[PDB]
Symmetry: C3
Subunit: 402 residues, 3 copies
């Protein structure tokens, strides 16, 4: 039961839902069909539960990486935009909303890491990673540092690692090959070796986490930091004069940060598929549609070419998109769990000097496969719980038989 004759939308609380409701208000005045916008707690946890039974919203807004799991479960419907509508959004975004060859969601916003520099300390940010060590010595004389960013999470260190030919899984033929991992290749080796060399030459500290990195830049202690659009608001409050720009190149190659895409998916159980399509394609994914949402709570860089060109007058939003286009799209597959587990360990152990770069990255392959087994066990036993509960109910009972 989702109610035929109306649309119900689920979007997270930190987004411009009131602005989205104004698009749904515009939709009513034209079609006479009422659009409700709901923003429930942990909707990402709730959606798989309710949609499995045939309930939940008509449309759901979330990051694309979580949509891979929804489509695996058959909770999302295959969308049908034509060639001409597909030309409206940046071609690279459409690859993020693909599962099993077929398209499963509409890309809305684009999210990726950028290089954030202090304008007062550093008017000309470096274009290369290689010139940062020399730039640190020049700033250490003034009692400052060149660069401080989170080293604990692989998400932040990956841009450098992937610069030279490092990848999570090979994306070819619209499918991720899980037998083709680019974690201990030549380019990932050099990327991490540069990061470790930065640490043992005291240009960075191996223990630097998110808090330590943010607090440093916002006090004016460090000239540069690596962070996403979610951090801009806190830098605005610190009164620091900052700029957001393209990430530094390593061995002439651009940094490849992970790209997160906010996407709109249609519930497979929805009896209003065509209505949702009309809403999303012809009301929301238009200049006026995205503007209403952006004015409530900024979307950052958007998928729609026409509206992105208008936001890109903000040099920070242009930088987000530029880094995104040069970046790697976040894979939406289940194997991504084992990847994080292994690479998080790999970088920690190389940065501490516990393992060589060569041996820490080699260990990732065997460490991720090990984690896949725990997940493989996890699913097997929860299946048995269900099986026993299944029979326990019908077949032999305190008041039944077979």
């Amino acid at each position: 039961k989702i109610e035929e004759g109306k649309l119900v939308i689920w979007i997270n609380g930190d987004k411009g839902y009131n602005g989205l409701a104004e698009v749904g208000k515009k939709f009513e005045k034209d079609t006479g069909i009422k659009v409700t916008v709901e923003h429930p707690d942990k909707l990402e946890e709730k959606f798989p539960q309710v949609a499995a039974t045939g309930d939940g919203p008509d449309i759901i807004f979330w990051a694309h990486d979580r949509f891979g799991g929804y489509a695996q479960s058959g909770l999302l419907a295959e969308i049908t935009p034509d060639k001409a509508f597909q030309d409206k959004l940046y071609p690279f975004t459409w690859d993020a909303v693909r599962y099993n060859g077929k398209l499963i969601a509409y890309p809305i916003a684009v999210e990726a890491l950028s290089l954030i520099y202090n304008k007062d300390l550093l008017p000309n940010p470096p274009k290369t990673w290689e010139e940062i060590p020399a730039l640190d010595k020049e700033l250490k004389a003034k009692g400052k540092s060149a660069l401080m960013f989170n080293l604990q999470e692989p998400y932040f260190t990956w841009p450098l690692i992937a610069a030279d030919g490092g990848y999570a899984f090979k994306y070819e033929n619209g499918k991720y090959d899980i037998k083709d991992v680019g974690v201990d290749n030549a380019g990932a080796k050099a990327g991490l070796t540069f990061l470790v060399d930065l640490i043992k030459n005291k240009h960075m500290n191996a223990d630097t986490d998110y808090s330590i990195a943010e607090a440093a830049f916002n006090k004016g202690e460090t000239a540069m930091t690596i962070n996403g659009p979610w951090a801009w608001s806190n830098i605005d409050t610190s009164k620091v004069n900052y700029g957001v720009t393209v990430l530094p190149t390593f061995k002439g190659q651009p940094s490849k940060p992970f790209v997160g895409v906010l996407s709109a998916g249609i519930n497979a159980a929805s009896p209003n598929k065509e209505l949702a399509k009309e809403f999303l394609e012809n009301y929301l994914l238009t200049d006026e549609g995205l503007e209403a949402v952006n004015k409530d709570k900024p979307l950052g860089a958007v998928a729609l070419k026409s509206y992105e060109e208008e936001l890109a007058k903000d040099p920070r939003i242009a930088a987000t998109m530029e880094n995104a286009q040069k970046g790697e799209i976040m894979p939406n597959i289940p194997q991504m769990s084992a990847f994080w587990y292994a690479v998080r360990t790999a970088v920690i152990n190389a940065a501490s000097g516990r393992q060589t770069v060569d041996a820490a990255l080699a260990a990732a392959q065997t460490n991720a496969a090990a984690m896949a087994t725990l997940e493989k066990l996890m699913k097997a036993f929860e299946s048995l719980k269900s099986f026993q509960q299944q029979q326990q109910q019908q077949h032999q009972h305190q008041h039944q038989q077979q």
Copy 2:
């Protein structure tokens, strides 16, 4: 040993063993070689144990789906019938007795699901699934229901599911591809959606089992049911005027029921491999041979073209074969274990409404891998135990080092 100079045959207690003994008695009169026919308890469980050590029968008669496990273990011999003898049996039946490319048994009988209708209530049975919802309303005016069949086991519901393009595993070039599963495709999806649509529209009950469906047809409460030849004798006692016909077509395409094939395999440890070929090919697999078995206990439809055409004068035996030819053969691979587990839950959850058809069939892949892991865990520890004794017991201990 299995004794050279004679044949010993294993065949289940519910088959025409006396009739087979007669065929052995004909064999003894022509060749001077004594044939013994035995029927031990749980011979399907006993065969893998004794054949592994080199003992057991020369020939074993059983459903082909169990012969995969025997051939995998190397307990069966590669049979050598020539082209001329292979034209004597229906072409599709040979696919049932093929493991790893090699042929490993002789096809004897053919079992499959068929549509059984009540002639007095419904003289003209529906040819399409699509017209059953309309046919139910017409019968509900007389307090009766159109169709009731077992919905708990997938074996019964699969015919519909596979109708439009669903399949267990892909079968090309004589071998299954365990990576080409067709339980999540558009055809299997539409098939199961029709089954669920029937239940949500009150034409069928989601909790109808084998007992409930059989009893309803034999009392005359329902007009149609889906079942195999095994159930005919119970309908015969109920005095119900019944017929057996082709399964209804869904989306203009036939239902594809799974096909069981009673097969005769030769033991790998048998010193009488040549005598078994002579007996199975030139004595049993003839009109006269199968006649003798069929008169003791009916074989149903048979693999041999000549004797089948003779049996097809019984319209029930013609329909069993017709449904079998349109259907697919029950895969004899070990991945079938996990396949059943996943599809049984898929259908139950779709029928009860715990999962949408799409979501129910999607979870099938993840449940098949679950049963695989679970099933592979138990092969791991079984092995560890065996080793443990072997090293533990044979290799050294008090009285040794």
Copy 3:
């Protein structure tokens, strides 16, 4: 830290380390670079532990089968010999030091099983397996047996099993295909059948192990035994007049023993990679180089063609190489643990009569998969433990960097 400017070598205690040190001394006299040769206890277990952290020796010497694991962990560097140097060694040996398509070590010495016969009892050794049952009946009349070897280990029985077309894994394009297992094909079946046929015809005993086999040949109770070079010293002491020859052919096909290659690998963490290449290629892998090592403790057959020709004037060393050249190199992959586990059981069960050849060899496929399961099972929990305790490592390090990060500046 491994020290740049000098070479440190790890070689097992039962090898000619003094002879190697003399090659190190020769290197020092020409180049002025000192070479230390260390022989630590259980170095094969220690090397992965220390080379992971960036320590350990510059060069390591060990059987090639263990090097695959070192390469998998990225502890070994890619060696760079040119075409002209690769012609110096036997082409087959280079396949033993290969992993992921890269070369990872220099082949030094070759080790393989051979047929060892008693000369006084049997001057003309049988060229075929098929004539051994007939030759046993002749010797039983004189109160002796024809052949006695270890039947408990698959390493010893495999030569016969592999002969007609049995293989652990298919080696093509320089890669090991783990999906193509030839343990229950027609050839391996026929081999094991002959072995089992020998036992139930009382020509061999199913309970015969390494100790029973060796002691029986050394006292002069059996005419032939199958064993490696490692056992020659014991037979020398027993005053038995013995020869080492090519293994008997089964169905006209040669017996295929597994080949062990003693190899020199360069540490990936070594700051002397170019120095180690100079040493190994131009000082050790020369007639004079291997001469010095061989005179300390014999190497057996060697990888270097030139020095092999000189050693082949020993009829025992020539036979070791002959058997090694007809046999297959032991796969350097992890899947080999499960293979030994399964084949060991297969043969034990077939020999005892517990299972038929067919049933035994078919059950090897499931027994190998079961062992593979156990291994990744114990690897997954080692992974969980390591991570689980890593959560603490962070907690403690949150109270360390917090201060120091302020001490220096603050």
